[PDB]
């Protein structure tokens, strides 16, 4: 590879995602990643980087899976593409559907296929509203979400999400979406009793339901753990109370499993850790470990019963819905996870080990709080020990500084506000977990003098 040419071509022809393109230009183009193996990334100048984010919350089985490349090759030779539009289907999405249904459990029996997690939430949006029309309750149209939630980057995905700065671009959210407080203990309930803060966050949902009018509410949607929002782990008892709220007013419960799904929290889906029974779930990312684009919506049997008994077209779907090659890779990816027991390993081995390893950072003068569940975790950066006070009293200044030192020291982790977030592949060893935490501590030590000088 000609790295200088790829950087020039990047600026001249490529618009990266979630990027300030003035910043990209000022650094002379994007940083070129050329190869990867196991849990490590290699860039244009030869630097080995421990990928503490598994690509983008997705590469769960790790890099270097020749077995997955082979699965794609074989299916592309036999049948690279056909549609599911013409009363037709192909083997791979059908066999993958039965496998996903096995992992979803409960009444989640069917899947609708898309490509990205964002589309899956578009599918949730249209299917939920169509379902209530078939049920004879057409007034049920409003979706209730939370501030700092992330549900994708489509128009509907941004609307369902709670990123106010993301809402601005596109003049979003669209109508029929409401947002309430997030159960963020460290930021918004610091010093509150967890049970009392939880009740406040649950009550905010009920207040919104009553304001909208229960007969007008279609569903509540939420991530089991808010990933892109900074690993917001809700207090104990939050999700059971939210489910009871949904059942009380007869609204659907939707869990966005795009990040929490497929082993991230020690379960096949995040909602199973909390023992709740959603009516729909969105999934992607870890579905194929990012090896090929594919996503799906898990659909409850009683939703399918309306489609099967009332009839009528559900006028919804994408060209690549059920793509046989992407489906075959996702199927093999699940089989690799089953074979190697990566879901159980996260719950019983690496998850707890990550929790103890991150807890050793608690004594650092810059660390306000560490938290983790399975193989996702966050480290809070504070200017005053024992508080949630942030440097310059302006969240987002200290974060990037610590992040850049981690990257300089060979660890790819990201800063969400002043929270350093990690999300490594599920194959990470305990020694590599110690390496990850070691680099964070090393970067915090270096960050201390520059942060004090702000």
Ligand X SMILES: *Cc1c(COP(=O)(O)O)cnc(C)c1O
Residues in binding site for pyridoxal 5'-phosphate = 117-118, 319
Instruction: Indicate whether 46 belongs to the interface with a copy of itself (CB under 8 A).
Output: no
- Nearest C-alpha neighbor of 268 from the set 108, 147, 379: 108
| Span 204-233, contacts to ligand X by CB under 6 A | 223, 227-228
- Tell the smallest beta-carbon distance from residue 203 to a copy of itself (Å): 29
Cis peptide before 173 (omega within 30 of 0): yes
Residues 6+ apart with CB under 8 A from 452: none
Give the C-alpha separation, 125 to 143, whole Å: 8
- Nearer Cβ to ligand X (267/432): 267
Q: Under the criterion CB under 6 A, does residue 117 sit at the interface with ligand X?
A: yes
> Candidates 22-30, 146-154, 330-338, 418-426 — which segment interacts with ligand X by CB under 6 A?
146-154
Using CB under 8 A as the binding rule, whether residue 27 contacts a copy of itself is answered as yes
7 or 371: CB nearest ligand X: 371
Should residue 359 be labelled a site residue for a copy of itself when binding is judged by CB under 8 A?
no
Q: Are 72 and 78 in contact (CB under 8 A)?
A: no
Closer by beta carbon to ligand X, 158 or else 444: 158
Residue from 39, 52, 60, 111 touching a copy of itself (CB under 8 A): that is 111
Q: Out of 41, 104, 108, 258, which residue is the one contacting ligand X (CB under 6 A)?
A: 258
Indicate which of a copy of itself, ligand X, none lies near residue 151 (CB less than 5 to 8 Å, by partner kind): ligand X
Residue 40: which residues within 8 A CB-CB, separation 6 or more?
48, 49, 50, 51, 63
Task: Check if the beta carbon of residue 231 is closer than 8 Å to that of residue 371.
Answer: yes
108-114 vs 295-300, strand pairing mode: antiparallel
Residues in region 317-356 near ligand X by CB under 6 A = 318-320
Q: Which one of a copy of itself, ligand X, none is in contact with 227 (Cβ closer than 5 to 8 A by kind)? A: ligand X
Output the smallest distance, CB 441 to ligand X, in A. 27
Cα(8)–Cα(55) distance, integer angstroms = 23
Sign of CA dihedral 77, 82, 87, 93: positive
Residues of span 51-70 touching ligand X by CB under 6 A: 57
Asked whether position 191 contacts a copy of itself by CB under 8 A, the answer is: no
Residue 346: partners with Cβ closer than 8 Å, 6 or more residues away: 263, 264, 265, 266, 374, 375, 426
Q: Which of residues 277-316 bind a copy of itself (CB under 8 A)?
A: 284-285, 289-294, 299, 304, 307-316
Task: Please report whether residue 259 would count as binding ligand X according to CB under 6 A.
Answer: yes
Torsion angles phi and psi, residue 430, rounded to 5:
-65, -40
User: 248, 240 in Cβ contact below 8 A?
Assistant: no
Judged by CB under 8 A, the stretch of 275-283, 320-328, 375-383, 445-453 that binds a copy of itself is 320-328
């Amino acid at each position: 590879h000609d790295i200088a040419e790829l950087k020039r071509l990047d600026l001249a022809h490529h618009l990266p995602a979630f990027a300030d393109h003035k910043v990209i230009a000022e650094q002379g183009g994007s940083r070129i990643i050329t190869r990867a193996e196991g849990v490590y990334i290699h860039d244009g100048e030869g630097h080995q980087i421990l990928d503490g984010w598994a690509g983008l919350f997705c590469v769960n089985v790790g890099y270097g899976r020749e077995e997955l490349a082979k699965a794609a090759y074989d299916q592309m030779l036999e049948l690279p593409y056909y549609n599911t539009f013409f009363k037709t289907a192909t083997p791979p999405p059908i066999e993958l559907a039965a496998k996903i249904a096995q992992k979803m459990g409960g009444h989640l029996s069917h899947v609708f296929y898309n490509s990205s997690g964002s589309e899956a939430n578009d599918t949730v949006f249209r299917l939920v509203r169509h379902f209530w029309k078939l049920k004879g309750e057409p007034s049920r149209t409003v979706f209730i979400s939370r501030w700092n939630a992330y549900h994708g980057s489509t128009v509907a995905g941004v609307s369902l999400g709670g990123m106010k700065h993301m809402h601005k671009q596109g003049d979003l959210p669209i109508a029929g979406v409401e947002h309430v407080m997030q159960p963020y203990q460290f930021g918004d309930g610091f010093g509150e009793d967890p049970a009392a803060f939880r009740d406040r966050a649950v009550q905010a949902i009920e207040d919104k339901i009553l304001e909208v009018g229960p007969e007008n509410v279609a569903a509540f949607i939420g991530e089991p753990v808010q990933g892109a929002g900074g690993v917001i782990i809700p207090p104990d008892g939050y999700w059971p109370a939210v489910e009871a709220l949904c059942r009380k007013y007869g609204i659907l419960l939707v869990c966005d499993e795009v990040a929490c799904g497929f082993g991230r929290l020690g379960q096949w889906f995040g909602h199973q850790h909390y023992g709740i029974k959603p009516d729909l779930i969105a999934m992607a990312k870890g579905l194929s470990s990012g090896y090929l684009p594919i996503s799906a919506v898990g659909v409850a049997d009683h939703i399918v019963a309306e489609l099967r008994e009332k009839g009528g077209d559900f006028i919804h779907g994408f060209t690549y819905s059920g793509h046989p090659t992407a489906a075959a890779v996702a199927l093999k990816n699940i089989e690799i996870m089953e074979r190697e027991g990566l879901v159980e390993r996260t719950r019983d081995e690496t998850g707890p080990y990550l929790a103890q390893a991150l807890a050793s950072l608690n004594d650092h003068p810059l660390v306000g709080e560490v938290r983790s569940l399975g193989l996702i975790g966050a480290v809070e950066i504070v200017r005053e020990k024992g508080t949630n006070h942030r440097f310059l009293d302006k969240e987002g200044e200290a974060g990037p500084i610590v992040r850049d030192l981690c990257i300089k020291n060979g660890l790819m982790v990201r800063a969400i506000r002043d929270s350093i977030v990690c999300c490594p592949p599920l194959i990470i060893t305990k020694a590599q977990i110690d390496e990850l935490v070691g680099i964070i501590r090393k970067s915090l030590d270096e960050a201390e003098p520059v942060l004090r000088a702000l």
